[PDB]
Design a protein around this ligand. Sequence first.
Ligand SMILES: C[As](C)(=O)[O-]
Ligand code: NA
Ligand SMILES: [Zn+2]
Ligand SMILES: [Zn+2]
Ligand SMILES: [Zn+2]
Ligand SMILES: [Zn+2]
Ligand SMILES: [Zn+2]
Ligand SMILES: [Zn+2]
Ligand SMILES: [Zn+2]
Length: 77
Amino acid sequence: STIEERVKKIIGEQLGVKQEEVTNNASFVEDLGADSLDTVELVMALEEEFDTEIPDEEAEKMTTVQAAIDYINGHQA
Ligand SMILES: C[As](C)(=O)[O-]
Ligand code: NA
Ligand SMILES: [Zn+2]
Ligand SMILES: [Zn+2]
Ligand SMILES: [Zn+2]
Ligand SMILES: [Zn+2]
Ligand SMILES: [Zn+2]
Ligand SMILES: [Zn+2]
Ligand SMILES: [Zn+2]
């Protein structure tokens, strides 16, 4: 599985959303129904899956699926 696939799987699982709905340009809050808890638990799930830290100032701007994919691809452990 590619990093795109693994990031999308974690997002779908954390947010209770179906894969077909996790499009690359989807907004976590505006398309995938993320509530405030979801935002911190999603960051935590990505950090744990990829063994990487995400600074909160960058999480605040990480508002789409592609933003999360690009962060993870760009910070490989
Ligand atoms: C706990 As699981 C179904 O993402 O391996
Ligand atoms: Na795919
Ligand atoms: Zn899984
Ligand atoms: Zn849905
Ligand atoms: Zn949208
Ligand atoms: Zn951690
Ligand atoms: Zn940890
Ligand atoms: Zn760890
Ligand atoms: Zn951490």
